[PDB]
Amino acid sequence: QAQITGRPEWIWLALGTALMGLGTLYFLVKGMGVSDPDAKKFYAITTLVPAIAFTMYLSMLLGYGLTMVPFGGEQNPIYWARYADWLFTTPLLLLDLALLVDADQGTILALVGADGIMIGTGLVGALTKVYSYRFVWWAISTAAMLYILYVLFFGFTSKAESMRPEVASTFKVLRNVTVVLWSAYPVVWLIGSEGAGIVPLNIETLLFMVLDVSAKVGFGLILLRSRAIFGE
Ligand SMILES: *C\C=C(C)/C=C/C=C(C)/C=C/C1=C(C)CCCC1(C)C
């Protein structure tokens, strides 16, 4: 019965794998030249971001990143490999914006640590047997997400507006893309296999695939095609 997997969403997973891989090879066979030590950081960060995602999408495709969790009434398919991906790649995406706005080490740590909680709490939620409690973890997770998005929006903007026109402009486009795509993740989870079965794992997988590529390759293509602070 149980929210069928290991087979339907294979195309979505495979397609995720393809885009993340090509996006990685792209950022690689583009960062060939690049002298500027500042620009060097952005290329490095933004190339690991989809490389993590490639590794993890492969595992889901090949089955390894799938597991079964007892909840609600049945044997529920869960892709923990998402959370393995998200754990590292999401802090890196924050580090891109931090570096771009030259944010204080204080905020950076507060940020990365908070992101740690947000995804880790997701990881606990996703695997919690007791149905009712999954939403306790979701609430904590989305609160931690909201905090991050707050400092990005109401914080990092002001600091950005004081940099260079290019920096303020570039940060803003990213900030927009970030706040939006981020806000979708807890909604997809809430309505998906993970939470309330409004939407099947099949669509949950597809939504997350489109969101993940957008939030990584799409994100990276805004960044690595602009003036990356002093550098290019
Ligand atoms: C793939 C790259 C990005 C930017 C991923 C972002 C992921 C999130 C903001 C995930 C948030 C979650 C929440 C708030 C609650 C359910 C569990 C999630 C981990 C999906």
CATH number at residue 84: 1.20.1070.10
The three-class DSSP label of residue 70 is strand
Q: How far is CA 81 from CA 64, 118, 123, in A?
A: 8, 16, 10
Count of domains observed in the chain = 1
Nearest one of 190, 167, 231, 204 to 60, comparing CA atoms: 204
| Residue ranges lining ligand 1, Cβ < 6 Å | 86, 89-90, 93, 118-119, 122, 138, 141-142, 145, 182, 185-186, 189, 212, 215-216
Helix 37-61 with 81-101: angle, nearest 10 deg: 170
| Spacing, Cα 177 to ligand 1 middle (Å) | 14
Q: How far is CA 81 from the centre of its chain?
A: 12
Method of elucidation? NMR
Task: For residue 119, give the ligand 1 atom closest to its CA.
Answer: 19
Residue 213 in tokens: 């590529």
| Spacing, Cα 33 to ligand 1 middle (Å) | 33
Q: How far is CA 197 from CA 46, 76, 110, in A?
A: 34, 11, 34
Q: How far is CA 37 from CA 69, 84, 103, 104, 192, in A?
A: 46, 29, 18, 19, 43
Please give the residue range of the domain that contains residue 179: 1-232
Distance CA 188, CA 108 (A): 27
| Spacing, Cα 165 to ligand 1 middle (Å) | 30
Q: Which helix (H) or strand (E) holds 203?
A: helix 201-213
Q: 14-20: long-range contacts (C-beta < 8 A, 24 or more apart)?
A: 14/61, 15/209, 16/53, 16/57, 16/60, 16/61, 16/209, 16/212, 16/213, 17/54, 17/57, 17/58, 17/61, 19/213, 19/217, 20/50, 20/51, 20/53, 20/54, 20/57, 20/212, 20/213, 20/216, 20/217
| Spacing, Cα 90 to ligand 1 middle (Å) | 8
CB atoms within 10 A of CB 37: 9
Distance CA 202, CA 192 (A): 9
